[PDB]
Ligand binder design. Structure first.
Ligand SMILES: CC(C)CCC[C@@H](C)[C@H]1CC[C@H]2[C@@H]3CC=C4C[C@@H](O)CC[C@]4(C)[C@H]3CC[C@]12C
Lengths: 53, 465, 336, 232, 215
């Protein structure tokens, strides 16, 4: 039963955490994603000069 | 100095076969052959048979109705100068080989003086053009009937009739189609499971079948709208020879190189397969694949050897076109070049193939007694199958090489007889019936084509599981 | 004795709590952003040394050298610019299921089916490469190894236990024990402060690299998960599953955000790795192609089909210059 | 440890012959491209011979082209040099140096103790500076000038810096003009551009004096500078 | 190129040659995955012949390898794909296991899962009915009906063993691709290694002829 005791202990430890609004988290991911769209040679195919492959 | 006192008579024939004679006296004393006017005209009508070969007829006609119909000026007979004789000696030497120029035509310093009056320049018979049913008008000494200048032997082979040609064409078309489909089915089978069937000796078999497929579609480059009339047939209307020429287009050199490369790569690939089998079967068990590391050298040798051979055939220029087969192939006029470049390679292929094949069969026959363990019943069945599979094929591959050799030596036997009788026929046509002694039988050509496409078929029987 | 009902009570409370904080459904917020058009990547180089299936790769922080570990019993360190090989490290155990590359570029950690993540040394005297350590202790099989620094290597074994090792001595300093089934994949953070381990019983847990308390536990998948990779920000991570559904989870929201699934797909995921920007999420499938999912709108943006057999590993370089896919053909392409 | 020692020195009458045997011991000899570089009694270093991994590639200096023969025996870990028809110009010490060539490697990173052998379109490295005295604690900049664009299409400049301590075998300091060697103090640094280089040594101390050759490696035969003798 | 890159490409070719050569020398040895249920007698056959354990033995000029993986408790379906391309699968079954508890059904069900698995479709499965003597003594006490209720035949060792053998040789859903060879462990003879050899040489011949494009 000690396994189940440690399980419920870990669940209680995990329960009391500050969940943030998925709206803000999504907006944050979108913000970071869009802000760094200039330094990505897969989104913006850089001319054959810089790309050494 | 070209004047002899001789008695002449008033003429009774005033025609040089297409023009008027502007004088009113003739002699016959210059003409050693004839005596009187009647015999002179007799000989004129006998020499009139030179209507054909116009480049000689147009230039002899002055000599014909000058040497037989000269002019006498108060018993003075004029004997022609070097110009008239020398015009019709070298380039028009048909007679010496045909009958022989008698003492009268052989121009001597006494009978034909050197640089005096001719007077024959007044009458010109420029418009003369005649090439009979087996002939066509040509203007290049390369593409003529070398013996008879002016004309050339026409694009259709005159030995065989159109019915025989159509029968041959129907046969080649049908048999080419059957081989094409069979080989294409094998290619379809190999592409069906590719990269699972990219295991090497099977891939060698795929290449053999693909090579013979390219060969078979090569044979069927004819049977379009008029593909034969551009492939076999020259621009003027004669058969094609000396394939690469500065003037003529690359129409059938391409269809020659396709069929020849296809064939030679096919038969070489077969030898490489047989070697691969021998080397594999030597290591049946022991999980050691020796031919794993020498695949590139197979490719290089098998692909390159036909290349150097076909370029050697284009170097020496003998590949020509045949009306019946309807495909330009090496050395029809000359026995030697075809003999060497088509039978020496197949000779080598048969001998090497035969040796390796017998060695391989002896190996996987001995496999039981030379196996330390015992073969499972299921295995011994599969080995004894694949042993009979090479045997039958080992015998069948012998037949398909022994058929062609029988069909060729048949050609090389009477190739002398045909070139003689064919020449004799057009001479006998030049006299006027008289026919050919022996025309090449279409049977041997059909059996030759059968041998080829049979070899194309046999390499496609292994994928029949 | 009866605490299973209270465990159920807390589980329901968790689901209630993470549910009552969901008002976005990211696919709703992303409605404004224009698509990435269509991206087609041409195979630039075909690195061909191996004679068997290759199971892992890892781009060294150089963004040039990749190490590719195969089943031939030889991992080779490639040079992605000139196709040249620089080492042929003949490993003692023929079976290999992972490969790592220490960020300094000094060490390279193999590890296979016999429980010993066995690290190697490249920048040495004497030319040849030696075995610095053989980190034994696991009772399953190594599934991934990853480097924190030249001293600390985390492992993801088949004993349901991710363990952080100490190269210097060769003993488990900490043992993270929360999972039920196998641990099939593991991925570090860009700050190396907390890693996530994708288990084999459809639970992706976020550990803490220091203490060893599983701060969060994410669920949503129905089958095994075979790949994890952090969003380069470090507040999101993909999961590759056998459900064919590469799901983008979140670390702060505590729940699934969106799902990448096409109803014409049946085969499982083997690898996932975000691009440097974090915009487009790659994924290595068993249909012998690695689709490129737009990681904002769930819409497929391309197909990288140059492989004969399934792709096993997919590494994205640390400047987004080029991705590389490790097939079972023994050829690993480098797309761009 | 890593240890290069050779033997077969002494004196030879001109037009004679000798075989110099470099006995490599402590590493993997087979994978190391071994070189041969000599030094006239009071001149700068010159390049002589070369042997690659498994004898798959050999080069020679134009001065000894076809007159010498280099050969190696991997299973015994030994490097031979067959020299015939010796002029009076080959009197020198003969170092056998290791060089390993892969990406991010350090070629010429160890030099043998060296044996004396007395007798009775190439790139030129115009090291303009010859001798500069410096006090322990200060910063001094040495100069090396090339005769050809050393920044190659690859993006890196093939120019090395060797320090020879008085009566020692010279060790590597910096390789490819920027990177430090294995087991060198961080005081040393290199800088510059194409066809203009420096070794800006910082806070110079004792046990650091000697001569600094700039062996350009861009093309073959390798040519060294005259060397800058640091006095105290 | 450059002066250094030439030597780099030379190193590339040198280690590439060494890699290919090791490839040849590695492909020269036949592999044999050794399955077997818990206490099936893997110890018996592994000692008869000579994490994971790799045992190298040679016989009649063939280098065998056995990976007795059975010494591992993890998700089978995750690492078993590491063994596709193995020659045969030596699958020992405890024949004295008909009496204990269900254990025979356990061994049969493992055979069923390993014999119809996606990756092993072509790999010919050997199986060793080991510990025949204990089963031979045991039949006179308890009939084979204990574990096979449907069984209808003689309670003689010879027929009972043949029924068990046939019951296993039935399991394979695919019959035309993978032939299932069988042997009882002759304790007082060397016929175990001999049978392994005969099995492997058969599958090698079949594979090697299918390679030649004849079969
Ligand atoms: C590979 C072996 C077993 C079989 C190959 C033999 C066959 C295919 C080869 C060998 C000699 C070749 C023949 C020799 C020359 C001629 C005369 C020509 O006017 C028609 C084609 C024909 C008839 C060739 C067709 C192909 C040929 C018959």
């Amino acid at each position: 039963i000690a396994q189940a005791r440690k399980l419920v202990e870990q669940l209680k430890m995990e329960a009391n955490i500050d969940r943030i609004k998925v709206s803000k988290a999504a907006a944050d991911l979108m913000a970071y994603c869009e802000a760094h769209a200039k330094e990505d040679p897969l989104l913006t195919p850089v001319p054959a000069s810089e790309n050494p492959f | 100095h070209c004047g002899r006192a001789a008695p002449c008579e008033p003429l009774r024939y005033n025609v040089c076969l297409g023009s008027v004679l502007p004088y009113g006296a003739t002699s016959t004393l210059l003409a050693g052959d004839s005596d009187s006017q009647e015999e002179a005209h007799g000989k004129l009508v006998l020499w009139s048979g030179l209507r054909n070969a116009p480049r000689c007829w147009a230039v002899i006609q002055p000599l014909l109705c000058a040497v037989y119909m000269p002019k006498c000026e108060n018993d003075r007979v004029e004997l022609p100068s070097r110009t008239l004789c020398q015009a019709t000696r070298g380039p028009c030497a048909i007679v010496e080989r045909e009958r022989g120029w008698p003492d009268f035509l052989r121009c001597t310093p006494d009978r034909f003086p050197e640089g005096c009056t001719n007077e024959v320049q007044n009458i010109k018979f420029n418009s003369s053009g005649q090439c009979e049913v087996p002939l066509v008008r040509t203007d290049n000494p390369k593409s003529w009937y070398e013996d008879v200048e002016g004309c050339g032997i026409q694009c259709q082979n005159p030995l065989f009739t159109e019915a025989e040609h159509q029968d041959m064409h129907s046969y080649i078309a049908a048999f080419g189609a059957v081989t094409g489909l069979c080989t294409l089915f094998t290619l379809a089978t190999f592409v069906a499971d590719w990269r699972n069937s990219n295991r090497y000796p099977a891939v060698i078999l795929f290449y053999v079948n693909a090579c013979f497929f390219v060969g078979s579609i090569g044979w069927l480059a004819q049977f379009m709208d008029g593909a034969r009339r551009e492939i076999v047939c020259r621009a003027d209307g004669t058969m094609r020879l000396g394939e690469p020429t500065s003037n003529e287009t690359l129409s059938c050199v391409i269809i020659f190189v396709i069929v020849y490369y296809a064939l030679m790569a096919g038969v070489v690939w077969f030898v490489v397969l047989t070697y691969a089998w021998h080397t594999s079967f030597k290591a049946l068990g022991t999980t050691y694949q020796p031919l794993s590391g020498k695949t590139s050298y197979f490719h290089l040798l098998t692909w390159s050897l036909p290349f150097v051979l076909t370029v050697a055939i284009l170097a020496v220029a003998q590949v020509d076109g045949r009306s019946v087969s309807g495909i330009c192939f090496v050395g029809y006029k000359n026995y030697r070049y075809r003999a060497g470049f088509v039978l020496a390679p197949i000779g080598l292929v048969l001998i090497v193939g035969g040796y390796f094949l017998i060695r391989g069969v002896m190996t996987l026959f001995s496999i039981k007694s030379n196996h330390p363990g015992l073969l499972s019943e299921k295995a011994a069945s599969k080995i004894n199958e694949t042993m009979l599979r090479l045997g039958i094929f080992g015998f069948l591959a012998f037949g398909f090489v022994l058929i062609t050799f029988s069909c060729h030596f048949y050609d090389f036997f009477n190739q002398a007889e045909w070139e003689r009788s064919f020449r004799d026929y057009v001479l006998c046509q030049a006299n006027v019936d008289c026919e050919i002694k022996n025309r090449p039988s279409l049977l041997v050509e059909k059996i030759n084509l059968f041998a080829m496409f049979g070899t194309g078929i046999a390499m496609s029987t292994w994928v029949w599981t | 004795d009866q605490l299973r009902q209270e465990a159920e009570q807390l589980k329901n409370q968790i689901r209630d709590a993470r549910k009552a904080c969901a008002d976005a459904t990211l696919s709703q917020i992303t409605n404004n952003i224009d698509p990435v058009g269509r991206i087609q990547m041409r195979t630039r180089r075909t690195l061909r040394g191996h004679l068997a299936k290759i199971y892992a790769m890892h781009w060294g922080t150089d963004s040039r050298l990749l190490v590719s570990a195969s089943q031939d019993g030889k991992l080779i360190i490639w040079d992605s610019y000139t196709t040249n090989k620089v080492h042929a490290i003949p490993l003692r155990s023929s079976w290999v299921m992972t490969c790592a590359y220490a960020p300094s570029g000094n060490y390279v950690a193999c590890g296979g089916l016999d429980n010993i993540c066995s690290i190697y040394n490249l920048k040495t005297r004497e030319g040849n490469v030696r075995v610095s350590r053989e980190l034994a202790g696991h009772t399953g099989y190594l599934s991934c190894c990853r480097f924190l620094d030249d001293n600390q290597i985390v492992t993801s074994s088949g004993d349901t236990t991710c363990a952080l090792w100490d190269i210097e001595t060769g003993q488990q300093t900490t043992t993270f024990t929360g999972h039920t089934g196998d641990v099939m994949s593991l991925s570090l953070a860009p700050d190396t402060r907390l890693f996530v381990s994708g288990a084999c019983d459809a639970s992706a847990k976020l550990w803490d690299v220091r203490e060893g308390m599983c701060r969060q536990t994410f669920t949503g998948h129905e089958s095994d998960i075979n790949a994890i990779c952090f969003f380069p920000n470090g507040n999101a991570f993909a999961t590759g599953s056998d459900d064919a559904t590469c799901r983008l989870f979140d670390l702060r929201a505590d729940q699934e955000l969106m799902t990448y699934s096409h109803d014409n797909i049946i085969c499982g995921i083997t690898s996932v790795s975000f691009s440097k920007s974090g915009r487009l999420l790659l994924a290595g499938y068993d249909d012998f192609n690695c689709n490129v999912w737009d990681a904002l709108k769930a819409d497929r943006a391309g197909v990288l089909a140059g492989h004969d057999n399934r792709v096993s590993c997919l590494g994205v370089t640390d400047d987004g210059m080029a991705v590389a896919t490790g097939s079972w053909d023994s050829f690993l392409k480098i797309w761009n | 440890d890593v240890q290069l020692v050779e033997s077969g020195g002494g004196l030879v009458q001109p037009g004679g012959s000798r075989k110099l045997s470099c006995s490599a011991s402590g590493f993997a000899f087979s994978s190391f491209g071994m070189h041969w570089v000599r030094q006239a009694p009071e001149k700068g270093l010159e390049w002589v011979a070369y042997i690659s991994s498994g004898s798959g590639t050999i080069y020679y200096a134009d001065t000894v082209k076809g007159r010498f023969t280099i050969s190696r025996d991997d299973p015994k870990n030994t490097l031979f040099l067959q020299m015939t028809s010796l002029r009076s110009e080959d009197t020198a010490m003969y170092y056998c140096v290791r060089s390993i060539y892969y990406y991010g490697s350090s070629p010429f990173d160890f030099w043998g103790q060296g044996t004396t052998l007395t007798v009775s379109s190439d790139i030129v490295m115009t090291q303009a500076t010859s001798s500069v005295p410096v006090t322990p604690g200060e910063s001094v900049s040495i100069s090396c000038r090339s005769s050809k664009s050393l920044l190659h299409s690859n993006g890196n400049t093939y120019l090395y810096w060797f320090l020879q301590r008085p009566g020692q075998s010279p060790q590597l300091l910096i390789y490819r003009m920027s990177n430090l060697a294995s087991g060198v103090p961080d005081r040393f640094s290199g800088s510059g551009s194409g066809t203009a280089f420096t070794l800006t040594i910082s806070r110079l101390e004792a046990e650091d004096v000697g001569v600094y050759y700039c062996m350009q490696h861009l093309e073959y035969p390798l040519t060294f500078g005259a060397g800058t003798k640091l006095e105290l | 190129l450059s002066a250094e890159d030439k030597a780099a490409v030379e190193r590339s070719k040198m280690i590439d040659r060494n890699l290919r050569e090791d490839g040849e020398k590695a492909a020269r040895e036949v592999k044999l995955l050794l399955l077997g249920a818990g206490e099936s007698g893997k110890s018996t056959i592994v000692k008869q012949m000579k994490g994971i354990v790799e045992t190298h033995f040679t016989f009649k000029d063939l280098h065998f390898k056995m990976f007795d993986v059975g010494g591992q408790r993890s998700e089978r379906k995750k690492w078993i794909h590491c063994f596709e391309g193995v020659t045969a699968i030596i699958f020992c079954v405890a024949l004295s296991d008909y009496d204990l508890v269900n254990r025979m059904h356990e061994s049969m069900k493992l055979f069923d899962s390993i014999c119809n698995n996606k990756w092993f479709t072509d790999t010919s499965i050997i199986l060793f009915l080991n510990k025949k003597d204990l089963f031979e003594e045991k039949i006179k006490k308890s009939p084979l009906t204990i574990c096979y209720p449907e069984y209808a035949g003689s309670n003689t060792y010879e027929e009972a063993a043949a029924y068990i053998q046939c019951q296993f040789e039935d399991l394979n859903k695919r019959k035309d691709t993978k032939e299932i060879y069988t042997h009882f462990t002759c304790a007082t003879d060397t016929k175990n290694v001999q049978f392994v050899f005969d099995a492997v040489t058969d599958v090698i011949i079949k594979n090697n002829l299918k390679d030649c494009g004849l079969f």
